[PDB]
C-alpha cells in the first residue's frame, strides 16, 4: 500500500486479484477469455454472459470534490472486416457510474475511445480519441492501446493514448463526484456481436505526469519479451508475415534465386494496406529445452525459417559469398544453416534480427538495400537520427480472427 496505486487488477492462480494492498474483490461472471501467453489480458464478449466485476474496497471509493485521481488500462478493439463495426453508436465497456449516472465511464464507438466523468449534480465532461480507419498501417486497430486519464479537480481532465496527450477539458464546474462501488467490465449496448481485450487496469489517487504515464507505457508489458504487430508476446514456432517499419506499403516476397524482394506494393482495401501478404517465417530456438516457454526474449539466439508450405521450412541465412559489405538474405533449399545464428532484440514494439556466425562474428542487422532484403553492419551505428534508421525494424504479423481480409 502507501503507493499512488489504490487498485491494480493482476492475475494470480486462476483468478484476477488486487495487488495494490487495499484488497478490492475481483469476480468473473460467464465466459471471460484469458490470453495463454499473458493471463493479465482478458477478453469479454457480448453474445453471452461475459463480465468482470471489481467490488471496490470502501477505503478507495472516490467520494471527494478536490482529490486528484488517474485511471490507466490497455484496450484491444478488433474491427473484424471494417464493415460490421461501421455504425455510429456509443457503447459502454467499463462502468463506474451510480444510479444517478454519477462517477466515470469508458465507452467506445466506430474507431473511437470515450471517457465520461459526471458529478452528483449531473454535470459531465467527455474526452475522446478517434483513431479512424487505417490509412496504410493503423497503430490502433486490433492493437493494444494504452489509455490513461488524469483528473486534477482544480484544472483539466487529460486523456493520454500510448503516452501522448491528445485531449484535455476543464472539470472546474464539477462538484462532488461519487463513483460506483462496482467497476463493471462488460460490453453494453453494442449493436453488433464483438469482443474487447482489457489488461493492466490501474486506479491511482493522484494526477500522473507525462514521465509516470510514459514509464507505465514502456514497462507495463515485459520489455524483456518481444512483441508482435498486435502488441502481444512474440512466439516461437508461429507463422508470421513481415512488415518493414520504414516500408509499410511494401511486403517481402521470394525470388527464384532464393533471395528476398521488397519491391512489392501492398494492395489496399479502401485505404488500408493488406497485412496477410508476402512470405511467412517461423522463429525457432537454437538451444531448445522443455523448461523454456514459447516467448521470444531479448538476446535470444534463434533461427528464422522461410515457410514454403505448412510442413516445409527452409533456413534463412546471410549469403557471405560476395565482395559486398551487405549480404543478401537467401533461402537454404538444402536445409544447411551455414554455421549462422540470429540474435533477437527490440526497440519498443519494433524487432531487430542480427545475423551472426556461430563463432560470434557479426554479419549484420536484417534490413534492405535497393529491392533486396540484406544483412548490414551499417545499422549498428545508425539505429537513430538517420532517415534510413527504421529499415532494420520489423513487425511480425499473425493472421488472427480480429483482422479479416478477403
Amino acid at each position: 500500500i502507501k503507493s499512488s496505486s489504490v487498485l491494480n487488477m493482476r492475475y494470480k492462480n486462476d483468478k484476477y486479484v488486487d495487488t495494490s494492498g487495499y484488497d478490492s474483490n475481483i469476480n468473473i461472471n460467464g465466459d471471460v477469455y484469458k490470453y495463454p501467453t499473458n493471463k493479465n489480458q482478458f477478453g469479454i464478449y457480448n453474445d453471452k454472459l461475459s463480465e468482470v466485476n471489481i467490488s471496490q474496497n470502501d477505503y478507495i471509493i472516490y467520494d471527494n470534490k478536490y482529490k486528484n485521481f488517474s485511471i490507466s488500462f490497455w484496450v484491444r478493439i478488433p474491427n473484424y472486416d471494417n464493415k460490421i463495426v461501421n455504425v455510429n453508436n456509443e457503447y459502454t465497456i467499463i462502468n463506474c457510474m451510480r444510479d444517478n449516472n454519477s462517477g466515470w465511464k469508458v465507452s467506445l464507438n466506430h474507431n473511437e475511445i470515450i471517457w465520461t466523468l459526471q458529478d452528483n449534480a449531473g454535470i459531465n465532461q467527455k474526452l475522446a480519441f478517434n483513431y479512424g480507419n487505417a490509412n496504410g498501417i493503423s497503430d490502433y486497430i486490433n492493437k493494444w492501446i494504452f489509455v490513461t486519464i488524469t483528473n486534477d479537480r482544480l484544472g483539466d481532465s487529460k486523456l493520454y493514448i500510448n503516452g501522448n496527450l491528445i485531449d484535455q477539458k476543464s472539470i472546474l464546474n464539477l462538484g462532488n463526484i461519487h463513483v460506483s462501488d462496482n467497476i463493471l467490465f462488460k460490453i453494453v449496448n453494442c449493436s453488433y456481436t464483438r469482443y474487447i481485450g482489457i489488461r493492466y487496469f490501474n486506479i491511482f489517487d493522484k494526477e500522473l505526469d507525462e514521465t509516470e504515464i510514459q514509464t507505465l507505457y514502456s514497462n507495463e508489458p515485459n520489455t524483456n519479451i518481444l512483441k508482435d504487430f498486435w502488441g502481444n508476446y512474440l512466439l516461437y514456432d508461429k507463422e508470421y508475415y513481415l512488415l518493414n517499419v520504414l516500408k509499410p506499403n511494401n511486403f517481402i516476397d521470394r525470388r527464384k534465386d532464393s533471395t528476398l524482394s521488397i519491391n512489392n506494393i501492398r494492395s489496399t482495401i479502401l485505404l488500408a494496406n493488406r497485412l496477410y501478404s508476402g512470405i511467412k517465417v517461423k522463429i525457432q530456438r537454437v538451444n531448445n529445452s522443455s523448461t523454456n516457454d514459447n516467448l521470444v526474449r531479448k538476446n535470444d539466439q534463434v533461427y528464422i525459417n522461410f515457410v514454403a508450405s505448412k510442413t516445409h521450412l527452409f533456413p534463412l541465412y546471410a549469403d557471405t559469398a560476395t565482395t559486398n559489405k551487405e549480404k543478401t538474405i537467401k533461402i537454404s533449399s538444402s536445409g544447411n544453416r551455414f554455421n549462422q545464428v540470429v540474435v533477437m532484440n527490440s526497440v519498443g514494439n519494433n524487432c531487430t534480427m542480427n545475423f551472426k556466425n556461430n563463432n560470434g562474428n557479426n554479419i549484420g542487422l536484417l534490413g534492405f538495400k535497393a529491392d533486396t532484403v540484406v544483412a548490414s553492419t551499417w545499422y549498428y551505428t545508425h539505429m537513430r537520427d538517420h532517415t534510413n534508421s527504421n529499415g532494420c525494424f520489423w513487425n511480425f504479423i499473425s493472421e488472427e480472427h480480429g483482422w479479416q481480409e478477403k
Epitope: 520504414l246 516500408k247 533471395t259 519491391n263 560476395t322 565482395t323 559486398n324 559489405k325 551487405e326 543478401t328 534490413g367 534492405f368 538495400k369 535497393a370 529491392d371 533486396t372 540484406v374 548490414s376 551499417w378 545499422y379 532517415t387 534510413n388 529499415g391
Partner: nanobody, 129 residues
Framework: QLQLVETGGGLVKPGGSLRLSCVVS????????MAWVRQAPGKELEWVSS????????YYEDSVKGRFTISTDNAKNTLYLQMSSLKPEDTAVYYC??????????????????????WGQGTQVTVSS
C-alpha cells in the same frame, strides 16, 4: 513505366569531353540515388559515380574525381554525366542505375544487379588514338 535510357556515348579523342544523358521514367529523383556504373570489356562492373539530389551530394570513384561531374535535372527528369579529360581506359559500357534512397546507403565498388533497383541498357564509350 519504370525505364532508364542512356544516350551520348561514342568515340572521342583521348582528352575529349562527353555528355551522357540517362532519361528515366516512372520515378522521381527525390526518391532514388542515381549512379553511373561502367563495365570494361570482360571485367566486372565498376561503380563510377553517384548523386543524391534531395541534398546536393556527389560521390566519385578516386580515378574519376575532378574530371567527370554527375548532375540531375528534375526539369526534363534526366540524369547527366558531364565527362571531360577522357583517358584511354575509361572505355567501357556505361549504365545509369537508380537505388532506393531509404535502403543501406553503402557504395560497393564492384556492384551486382541487386545493388540498384533499376538499370539501363548502357551506352558504349570508346576512346582510342
Amino acid at each position: 513505366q519504370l525505364q532508364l535510357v542512356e544516350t551520348g556515348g561514342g568515340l572521342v579523342k583521348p582528352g575529349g569531353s562527353l555528355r551522357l544523358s540517362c532519361v528515366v521514367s516512372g520515378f522521381t529523383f527525390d526518391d532514388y540515388r542515381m549512379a553511373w556504373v561502367r563495365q570494361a570489356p570482360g571485367k566486372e562492373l565498376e561503380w563510377v559515380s553517384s548523386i543524391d539530389s534531395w541534398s546536393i551530394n556527389t560521390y566519385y570513384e578516386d580515378s574519376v574525381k575532378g574530371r567527370f561531374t554527375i548532375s540531375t535535372d528534375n526539369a526534363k527528369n534526366t540524369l547527366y554525366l558531364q565527362m571531360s579529360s577522357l583517358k584511354p581506359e575509361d572505355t567501357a559500357v556505361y549504365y545509369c542505375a537508380a537505388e532506393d534512397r531509404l535502403g543501406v546507403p553503402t557504395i560497393n565498388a564492384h556492384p551486382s544487379k541487386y545493388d540498384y533497383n533499376y538499370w539501363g541498357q548502357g551506352t558504349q564509350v570508346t576512346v582510342s588514338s
